Amino acid sequence: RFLKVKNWETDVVLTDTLHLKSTLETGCTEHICMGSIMLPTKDQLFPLAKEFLDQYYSSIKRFGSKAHMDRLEEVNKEIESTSTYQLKDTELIYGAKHAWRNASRCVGRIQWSKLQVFDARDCTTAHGMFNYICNHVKYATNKGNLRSAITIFPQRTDGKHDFRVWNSQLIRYAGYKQPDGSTLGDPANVQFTEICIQQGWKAPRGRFDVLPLLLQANGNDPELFQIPPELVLEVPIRHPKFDWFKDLGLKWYGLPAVSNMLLEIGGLEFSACPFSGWYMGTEIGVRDYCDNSRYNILEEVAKKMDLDMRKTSSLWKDQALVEINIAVLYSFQSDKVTIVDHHSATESFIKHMENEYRCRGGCPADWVWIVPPMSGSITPVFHQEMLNYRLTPSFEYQPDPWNTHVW
Amino acid sequence: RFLKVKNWETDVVLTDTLHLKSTLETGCTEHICMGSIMLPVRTKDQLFPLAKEFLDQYYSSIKRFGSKAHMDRLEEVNKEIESTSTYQLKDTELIYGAKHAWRNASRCVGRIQWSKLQVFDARDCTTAHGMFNYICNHVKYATNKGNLRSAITIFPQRTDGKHDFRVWNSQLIRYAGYKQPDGSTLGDPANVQFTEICIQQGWKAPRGRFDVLPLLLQANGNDPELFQIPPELVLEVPIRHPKFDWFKDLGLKWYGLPAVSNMLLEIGGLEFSACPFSGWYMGTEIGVRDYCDNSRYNILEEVAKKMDLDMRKTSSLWKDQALVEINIAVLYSFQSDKVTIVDHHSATESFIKHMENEYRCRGGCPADWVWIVPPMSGSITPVFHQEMLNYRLTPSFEYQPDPWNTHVWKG
Ligand code: HEM
Ligand code: HEM
Ligand SMILES: Nc1ccc2ccc(CCNCc3cccc(F)c3)cc2n1
Ligand SMILES: Nc1ccc2ccc(CCNCc3cccc(F)c3)cc2n1
Ligand SMILES: C[C@H](O)[C@H](O)[C@H]1CNc2nc(N)[nH]c(=O)c2N1
Ligand SMILES: C[C@H](O)[C@H](O)[C@H]1CNc2nc(N)[nH]c(=O)c2N1
Ligand SMILES: [Zn+2]
Incomplete structure (x- = not known):
């Protein structure tokens, strides 16, 4: 119930209790470990809201205050009524920062609390989403002095009216299959590159062609937009x-700037939430x-x-x-x-784990992802035992839109 | 229940059914993965089911399952268990057993080689000098003037847990470590503690950067004894x-x-606490x-x-x-x-081929990604991109506590 992790290079031992709050499941059982698998109603919504607001109000040292109980009451009434609810700005910002904080595969999380949150919940059209996105790109880029940021579009309602960025990252290079047999540009994006083309994009057909954004507002057919070249550093x-x-x-x-993930805060689902760091x-x-x-x-x-x-x-x-x-x-x-x-990065992360063990009672971490793809054992994270578990708020994967969208 | 693993470089998808034969536990639950944790006296009670499942597997591998010999062997083992509380493996079952423990070692990237394992049966061994003699023969055979051959030497199994055979060394060949009074270490820092135990038992330390450690060998639960491996045997x-x-x-x-010397070989509920093995x-x-x-x-x-x-x-x-x-x-x-x-x-390319073959012939290959992926250039090896399922099959190699922590000194 209280768990130990050891660093084998330094003998430092940390005790983990944060895992006892873990709410989602891992993929693993007592019989089989799935640590290396890439991807493993009103009724449902109120406990999710409560759990979130309880942690939000505890985070501001107001757990069990009239303010706490009132908001719990308020959200409860709104669920009862509308079958959903709305986050206050403060809760939204907290939710987003914490989703990063809980990202067990992210080595960069020392930075988690310096996250600029752009609230685009008032967005209604693909053109609006494009404006929001260009503002995010320019803000985060900061002429090379990059700053972390997330832009949050309206939350799923009935799954018929989803906002989505079809791009996997906001900025990515096109990939084209050739008669040739081989591949020009980036082979990971061949399929997305064809979806653009088949929606109308005139491809320069180069090795390093910045893809156009394919933006879906409110469940409509997505639309193409070229990010002003001047914004793509x-x-x-x-x-x-x-x-x-x-x-x-x-x-x-x-x-x-990863743009195909789903942000879940207090049971609410934000299916368009492009975020970026460096x-x-x-x-x-x-x-x-x-x-x-x-x-x-x-x-x-x-x-x-x-x-x-x-x-x-x-x-x-x-x-x-x-x-x-x-x-x-x-x-x-x-x-x-x-x-x-x-x-x-890895040195930073060890310090961050130390801070989290000390201040929060642990830090979910996925060793398979945290250890870099070169020079593994000469980085300190190689020698660091890690416990992996799923906390909420979180970022989650979602099916590529073209499989879902009623076209 | 069938489980799939995908290779994200090749798109090759494999189906695992073998994990259904898995018995021992992983450390993980539905709420926590312990896949990066380094480490995650039996009654008749628990012994006969373990022997039965083992002999069922052995008899199946030789295409004799349910035969008269299979049945007579179960009955004979059972009788021996209730009469003596333990049992002896036939030579053939020992061989199969030791090979399967290698085949089942999910952290081993070298397993393409599992079936070419020279098994030395040292169960008639009674003394530490006897152990030294078995180990030298092992080293000379395995070494083979540079053309290395896989081998394992199998000393007598645990009985009451008070008469254990153990090789105190962690590998048969390893260099001394010496913590100096300024706090600097000479030789290999990993072996400081053990170096210190050898000194104390009376080893005269040359005190260089690469001194081959002596063997510290316990027979029959007696205090361990020092021996020097003949230098001409140490390539x-x-x-x-x-x-x-x-x-x-x-x-x-x-x-x-x-040549790893501190693991425990479990075969059919039997525990071989001294079972040094070597590869390359x-x-x-x-x-x-x-x-x-x-x-x-x-x-x-x-x-x-x-x-x-x-x-x-x-x-x-x-x-x-x-x-x-x-x-x-x-x-x-x-x-x-x-x-x-x-x-x-x-090695990793060989492992990927071993693994695919194993999925096809065996219905699975348990594999620990954290350990299989090499400690440099991880993603330019094919294993990095290979999803793997980790589960524990017997026969198996297991960790055991360092014996200086548990031994009752005779004096
Ligand atoms: C500030 C600099 C940052 C660094 C250096 C960084 C580093 C990383 C790296 C190296 C990965 C593994 C990527 C891969 O191999 O595909 C990763 C994963 C991730 N990071 Fe970050 N990160 C940063 C900021 C962010 C931010 C701002 C967020 C969200 C607010 C975030 C959330 C994630 C998530 C969710 C994953 C895992 C995605 C998946 O499971 O596929 N990180 N991080
Ligand atoms: C023949 C050539 C072999 C190669 C190239 C090889 C390769 C390896 C390597 C690289 C590791 C991880 C080592 C480490 O990082 O500490 C390992 C682990 C292991 N191998 Fe092998 N292996 C070989 C033969 C064997 C043999 C003969 C056995 C026993 C019969 C064996 C059983 C194991 C076991 C049990 C582990 C995991 C040990 C642990 O959990 O600490 N391997 N193998
Ligand atoms: N420097 C950063 C900052 C934030 C990041 C956030 C997420 C990712 C992961 C990108 N995800 C693409 C992907 C990778 C692997 C499998 C898969 F299905 C999808 C990398 C980051 N890299
Ligand atoms: N080339 C080979 C062949 C067989 C092997 C068998 C076991 C091992 C692992 C030995 N591990 C030593 C160790 C060192 C530090 C911590 C720890 F848990 C274990 C390596 C092999 N390496
Ligand atoms: C099969 C395996 O899970 C897959 O290749 C993983 C391994 N570790 C990774 N680690 C990071 N940071 N990013 C990745 O895409 C992957 N891929
Ligand atoms: C904490 C972590 O599990 C530990 O460092 C492991 C990681 N992977 C490894 N992989 C191999 N082959 N050998 C090791 O000693 C380790 N150490
Ligand atoms: Zn696991």
């Missing part, structure tokens, strides 16, 4: 030592560039380095991987775009 | 780098034979963990110094750079000296 990728690196023609965008280097250089099903450029870089690609045991892949990642970090830093390396 | 590899000539001057070497190294075990863990030899700084990398910011990735160079060196040295080693690309 990009970084040309060069190496501090290899001059030929530039000639690979690589670039990436400064702003990581990149850890490995996300671009390890995953985006080197995944076989992504830009997959390892082979080409190794060649330019004249490495022995005859045997896996020369560690040419590994040698090239490190160089690609040095280059990503160097380019972002050169151009003054905020970026974090995996050593610094 | 070692000096570490050098193909392009960096100063690498040799770091004075590094490692031993060739990874995956390069990252030495190059990443043994050399570059902060808590181990910790050579990253000195290597990056010699490479004259930019060490003033972590964002130069000097650490990642030194790490690759050290690991290139470990593989280069082993291959040059013709001592078996596998790199992490080769």
